[PDB]
Design a protein around this ligand. Sequence first.
Ligand SMILES: CCCCCCCCCCCCCCCCCC(=O)OC[C@H](COP(=O)([O-])OCC(O)COP(=O)([O-])OC[C@@H](COC(=O)CCCCCCCCCCCCCCCCC)OC(=O)CCCCCCCCCCCCCCCCC)OC(=O)CCCCCCCCCCCCCCCCC
Ligand SMILES: CCCCCCCCCCCCCCCCCC(=O)OC[C@H](COP(=O)([O-])OCC(O)COP(=O)([O-])OC[C@@H](COC(=O)CCCCCCCCCCCCCCCCC)OC(=O)CCCCCCCCCCCCCCCCC)OC(=O)CCCCCCCCCCCCCCCCC
Ligand SMILES: CCCCCCCCCCCCCCCCCC(=O)OC[C@H](COP(=O)([O-])OCC(O)COP(=O)([O-])OC[C@@H](COC(=O)CCCCCCCCCCCCCCCCC)OC(=O)CCCCCCCCCCCCCCCCC)OC(=O)CCCCCCCCCCCCCCCCC
Ligand SMILES: CCCCCCCCCCCCCCCCCC(=O)OC[C@H](COP(=O)([O-])OCC(O)COP(=O)([O-])OC[C@@H](COC(=O)CCCCCCCCCCCCCCCCC)OC(=O)CCCCCCCCCCCCCCCCC)OC(=O)CCCCCCCCCCCCCCCCC
Ligand SMILES: CCCCCCCCCCCCCCCCCC(=O)OC[C@H](COP(=O)([O-])OCC(O)COP(=O)([O-])OC[C@@H](COC(=O)CCCCCCCCCCCCCCCCC)OC(=O)CCCCCCCCCCCCCCCCC)OC(=O)CCCCCCCCCCCCCCCCC
Ligand SMILES: CCCCCCCCCCCCCCCCCC(=O)OC[C@H](COP(=O)([O-])OCC[N+](C)(C)C)OC(=O)CCCCCCCCCCCCCCCCC
Ligand SMILES: CCCCCCCCCCCCCCCCCC(=O)OC[C@H](COP(=O)(O)OCCN)OC(=O)CCCCCCCCCCCCCCCCC
Lengths: 59, 93, 196, 103, 110, 74, 44, 43, 62
Amino acid sequence: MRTKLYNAAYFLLNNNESFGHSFGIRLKIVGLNTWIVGYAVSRYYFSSLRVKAAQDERF
Amino acid sequence: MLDDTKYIQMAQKFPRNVSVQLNKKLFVTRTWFRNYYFVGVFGIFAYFIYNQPKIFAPFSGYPTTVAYKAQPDFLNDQVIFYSQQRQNTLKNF
Amino acid sequence: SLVSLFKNTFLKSRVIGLSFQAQRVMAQMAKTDFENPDEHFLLNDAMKYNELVFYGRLAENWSINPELFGKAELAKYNEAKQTLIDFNQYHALVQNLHEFYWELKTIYLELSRGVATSNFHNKREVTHSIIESDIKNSIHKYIQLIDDLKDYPEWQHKVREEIGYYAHMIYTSVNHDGNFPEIFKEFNKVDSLYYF
Amino acid sequence: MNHSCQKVFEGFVSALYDTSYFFRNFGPFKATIHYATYANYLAQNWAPRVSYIETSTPAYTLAKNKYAVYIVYGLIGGALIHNYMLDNKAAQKSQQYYLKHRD
Amino acid sequence: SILPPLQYTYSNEESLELLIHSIKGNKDCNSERKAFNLCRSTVLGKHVEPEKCLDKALVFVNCFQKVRRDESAACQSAFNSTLECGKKYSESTISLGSSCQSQLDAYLNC
Amino acid sequence: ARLWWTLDPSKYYLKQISSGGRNEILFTVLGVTAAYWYFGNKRCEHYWRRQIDNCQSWSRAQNINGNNLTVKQY
Amino acid sequence: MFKELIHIFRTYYITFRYLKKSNINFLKNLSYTLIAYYLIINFQ
Amino acid sequence: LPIRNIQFARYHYLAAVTVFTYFATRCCLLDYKKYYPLASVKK
Amino acid sequence: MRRIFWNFKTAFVGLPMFSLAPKNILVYPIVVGVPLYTFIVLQNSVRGFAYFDEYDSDVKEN
Ligand SMILES: CCCCCCCCCCCCCCCCCC(=O)OC[C@H](COP(=O)([O-])OCC(O)COP(=O)([O-])OC[C@@H](COC(=O)CCCCCCCCCCCCCCCCC)OC(=O)CCCCCCCCCCCCCCCCC)OC(=O)CCCCCCCCCCCCCCCCC
Ligand SMILES: CCCCCCCCCCCCCCCCCC(=O)OC[C@H](COP(=O)([O-])OCC(O)COP(=O)([O-])OC[C@@H](COC(=O)CCCCCCCCCCCCCCCCC)OC(=O)CCCCCCCCCCCCCCCCC)OC(=O)CCCCCCCCCCCCCCCCC
Ligand SMILES: CCCCCCCCCCCCCCCCCC(=O)OC[C@H](COP(=O)([O-])OCC(O)COP(=O)([O-])OC[C@@H](COC(=O)CCCCCCCCCCCCCCCCC)OC(=O)CCCCCCCCCCCCCCCCC)OC(=O)CCCCCCCCCCCCCCCCC
Ligand SMILES: CCCCCCCCCCCCCCCCCC(=O)OC[C@H](COP(=O)([O-])OCC(O)COP(=O)([O-])OC[C@@H](COC(=O)CCCCCCCCCCCCCCCCC)OC(=O)CCCCCCCCCCCCCCCCC)OC(=O)CCCCCCCCCCCCCCCCC
Ligand SMILES: CCCCCCCCCCCCCCCCCC(=O)OC[C@H](COP(=O)([O-])OCC(O)COP(=O)([O-])OC[C@@H](COC(=O)CCCCCCCCCCCCCCCCC)OC(=O)CCCCCCCCCCCCCCCCC)OC(=O)CCCCCCCCCCCCCCCCC
Ligand SMILES: CCCCCCCCCCCCCCCCCC(=O)OC[C@H](COP(=O)([O-])OCC[N+](C)(C)C)OC(=O)CCCCCCCCCCCCCCCCC
Ligand SMILES: CCCCCCCCCCCCCCCCCC(=O)OC[C@H](COP(=O)(O)OCCN)OC(=O)CCCCCCCCCCCCCCCCC
């Protein structure tokens, strides 16, 4: 059975002011939360790093 | 009051011998998707909560440490060690 | 027997108190759909739902000491115990139907992930045999279930409206060629006409 | 998939389903799960709280339910302040003791 | 506990005396201290053969002792004023206020 | 978009127990007792300490095999 | 807040649809427990 | 309808969020090792 | 063969996304963090960004 397909609406709709206005707020909140979580993860990651070793050192 | 007549009837009168066989494969597929989204998504948050304190507060997890003193042994070319137990504490603020 | 007194008092209190609520909880469970029958209790208000689920087992299993019971009190306790057993069976039935619903929804979700626009990596033109067999057997079981609920028009109608929805969406997801006439043979009788 | 791999996969998923079902529905395991679920529900949905819906006329509400927040705050603040005072007293006592013992 | 334990118990008066003398010394005899630290930085000078630093160490200690023993009358007066101000500041369990910097500057210029 | 942020408590968790308000005082008593015990132990361990460094504080080292630790000058 | 995160993941991710409301609630309970543990432990 | 001690609940939730964010991000307890090259020296 | 129909320059998912998303994602980050980060960094440096050299940096071995 050949599965049916469709043309995604957002690929063929003229850009509108409503999309912009609403997705702007959604992206603002997404950016805020992502920035907070990424800052936490960045602090964790950098603090996880090892200490600098000597030159040509084994173990 | 809401007219829950039909729902009341459904609750009062339900079959007590009707059951449906479950395709084991599809049940397993859904459950393992659930496990995928637990271990690999919520696992990140859980491990962060569990470990980040252990990264920023390490001194409280290793209570006792050891210290050494050494002396030479010339006639045998050896080194003699004396150990000592200490309470692992901050130093050089 | 002080410990016996306390055990029996605890059992009486919990069982009788919950028996007055079983009607409401069962009605609410019927009201929602089969995707998450306990949705209202998890999200909005736990109207003694978890209490019923927990104390049904105790009513079934824990013993009784009639000498600590009155006459009317003992009759009331037996009535409440029977109500809790009825709730146990009702919950089991709803769970079975809900799991079958989730089977059908799993099939539909696989199809949807197949036809998703973001699916640039696993796009398949022709449905493979395994999912076709799964669809056929799932629809067979669904038809058998509908038949088995001929004595309960409300239950039959709810099962149709809830579970057959995803059967209809699966019907719409594919073209009418290949093995389609055979796969949806049972569905084409009555259910297909309902979902138009 | 290949029908041989199909046999293997069907057997494996059947084994997984059977194992899960047995572990969940075994007598002792079933009882353990059944009790722990209710314990978890009690803990999550009936944890101690300071804010709750008041559905009773002022004449039908106890005094405890009008001053519970204040009692809790008093207890916690008193505990913190008393621990602080005990820390200061212990600091002074230790200093004096080790001073009088030497230097 | 994570804070290190104490070795020598210093009285509050003794602690303030040593602290003020140390602040004065870091100005009067910084040269000796720097030389001693330089000689105690190397592996040979710190662990293997510390005696090569001994002389330098001695000099430093002498200087510090000379500071600890306020010889000039003006030095004694300024040090006593600063020490009294420090004691008053320390004993003040009530909300603390003005600092003792003025007395310290007066003493360091003696 | 829809506004959803708020500090108000959710009605799902706002129920009382049958006999009155939720068990707040009873749990706070336990919390205070536990805090008292924990902080008392911490304070007692922290404040009554000294570091004594002399010959008697050193003992002979040994391997995990129990033998005396000695390393050659290889 | 948690509700909103779950809602966004459900509405945007097709795979996340596999989880029941019960599994979501279990994640909610575990997350609340972990948050309480984090708050308590950081002060110890 | 009335909610006992609603304001206390709001402030408790706000405090919990603030404390959790403070400890998770360590927003206030930054690291200055990156600024050391861009700093003057004394003594 | 997957055939995609898409108005690159006018569809809501296209150049309009490039114009919209970057200026909206960074709204709260900039306006909050930058003042907040500045306050957090500067409040330490009431007197200056001075490194009180605990080690003899000016001392070089002869
Ligand atoms: C498409 C390809 C793209 C490829 C990209 C490749 C990128 C490679 C990056 C390499 C690593 C860089 C690390 C930089 C660290 C900076 C901090 C620092 O120096 O710390 C010192 C660091 C110690 O760190 P720490 O002090 O402990 O903490 C650091 C923290 O950041 C905390 O420090 P802080 O407190 O000072 O923090 C400052 C504060 C500052 O925050 C603020 O205040 C924000 C201010 C923002 C202002 C922005 C203004 C922009 C203007 C926009 C205008 C638009 C107008 C539009 C108009 C339209 C029309 C109207 O917070 C932040 O900086 C926020 C950071 C959190 C980020 C949150 C988002 C994370 C997820 C998203 C990531 C990006 C995805 C992009 C996807 C693109 C797809 C197309 O130690 C060092 O000395 C390390 C130096 C850095 C090198 C590390 C090397 C590691 C190597 C690992 C091995 C693997 C490497 C792989 C490389 C691959 C290359 C391809
Ligand atoms: C490392 C830390 C560990 C601790 C912290 C843990 C934290 C995490 C949470 C853990 C959650 C999961 C726990 C593990 C699962 C346990 C499952 C289980 O019990 O399996 C039984 C279950 C069989 O029972 P069943 O099938 O439900 O019942 C039918 C049977 O034929 C039996 O029929 P039957 O009638 O012959 O016998 C019924 C009854 C034995 O019947 C009796 O003899 C009477 C028992 C007491 C009845 C309640 C009286 C209450 C009176 C008022 C008390 C007031 C106190 C003061 C406060 C006043 C103000 C409020 O036996 C049970 O079923 C015992 C179940 C456990 C206790 C249930 C009672 C709960 C209420 C009372 C305790 C809590 C205080 C409430 C206070 C407030 C009340 C308003 O399945 C098994 O046999 C599995 C065995 C293998 C698994 C492990 C078994 C462990 C056994 C532990 C026994 C503990 C006894 C209580 C000790 C109390 C010490 C102070
Ligand atoms: C403290 C140290 C020791 C701890 C030991 C813990 C042992 C736990 C074992 C659990 C075993 C399975 C239990 C199955 C259920 C059996 C009982 C039952 O069905 O309920 C009967 C009884 C009445 O139930 P019900 O009739 O269904 O009522 C609910 C209905 O909705 C009807 O509602 P209603 O409106 O009609 O009102 C009825 C009312 C009636 O309730 C009452 O009457 C109970 C009121 C409280 C107790 C009153 C008595 C106080 C004095 C007791 C003296 C005992 C002396 C013992 C001496 C022993 C000597 C050997 O019910 C309630 O209000 C329920 C209260 C639930 C409280 C839950 C607390 C959650 C938070 C706990 C941790 C908090 C940490 C805070 C830290 C924060 C730091 C900043 O409820 C209880 O027994 C409540 C038990 C609650 C706690 C259980 C779970 C504790 C877990 C703690 C965390 C441990 C995690 C460790 C890591 C995990 C791995 C180890
Ligand atoms: C360094 C520290 C360690 C870092 C790594 C830590 C990893 C921890 C464990 C992570 C476990 C993840 C898997 C469990 C979660 C649930 C997954 C799931 O739904 O399972 C089924 C689902 C598959 O469903 P399906 O039915 O096969 O797909 C058809 C459905 O319609 C699809 O429907 P749908 O809506 O469900 O599918 C969306 C699907 C996404 O899946 C997709 O449908 C497509 C995935 C590939 C997209 C590739 C980009 C496409 C083009 C976009 C434009 C890019 C432009 C770049 C250049 C710009 C130049 C200016 O979303 C997810 O996968 C959800 C979770 C995603 C985030 C967590 C994973 C992060 C992995 C990051 C590392 C990846 C490897 C290194 C890559 C770089 C090497 C140089 O996901 C998978 O099985 C794949 C999992 C992801 C694999 C990696 C793909 C690349 C992702 C990159 C994300 C980067 C984000 C930025 C921050 C990164 C920071 C590290
Ligand atoms: C096997 C079993 C199953 C396992 C399943 C897997 C997961 C584990 C489950 C285990 C079961 C327990 C889980 C934890 C509880 C989860 C609760 C929850 O999710 O509730 C959500 C739910 C969310 O509701 P919501 O609608 O979002 O509203 C939340 C808002 O925050 C609204 O909040 P609110 O407004 O209602 O406030 C809540 C209330 C809650 O607080 C309380 O009332 C409780 C107090 C503490 C009691 C602690 C008792 C601890 C006893 C421990 C005993 C020993 C146990 C040993 C056990 C050993 C093993 C047997 O807060 C307060 O009372 C605020 C006090 C503030 C004090 C301020 C001080 C002021 C001082 C200054 C005074 C004035 C000076 C003036 C000077 C003027 C100068 C000019 O929370 C609540 O509604 C309840 C409140 C939150 C309770 C949190 C409790 C956390 C406990 C964690 C314990 C971890 C123990 C680990 C042990 C490990 C051992 C190895
Ligand atoms: C360390 C690893 C880091 C890797 C970084 C990777 C970054 C990935 C960023 C992905 C952004 C989001 C799109 C993919 C994920 C979508 C998930 C989702 O829910 O979507 C589902 C939906 C699609 O599904 P749907 O529309 O069918 O919705 C589901 C509907 N049912 C349920 C009925 C099936 O949305 C999409 O996937 C939209 C895709 C849009 C793709 C846009 C591509 C733009 C490319 C721009 C290139 C610019 C180049 C410039 C070069 C300049 C040179 C000078
Ligand atoms: C938005 C949705 C997604 C969000 C995701 C969020 C994720 C949160 C994760 C939380 C946990 C963080 C853990 C951080 C661990 C970091 C380890 C690391 O790589 O550190 C760098 C390390 C070198 O560091 P270090 O030794 O300290 O040296 C510098 C010292 N000054 O580097 C090394 O030592 C290098 C060797 C180790 C790293 C190997 C990585 C292998 C990756 C294999 C990828 C395979 C798949 C490829 C796919 C594409 C194929 C075409």
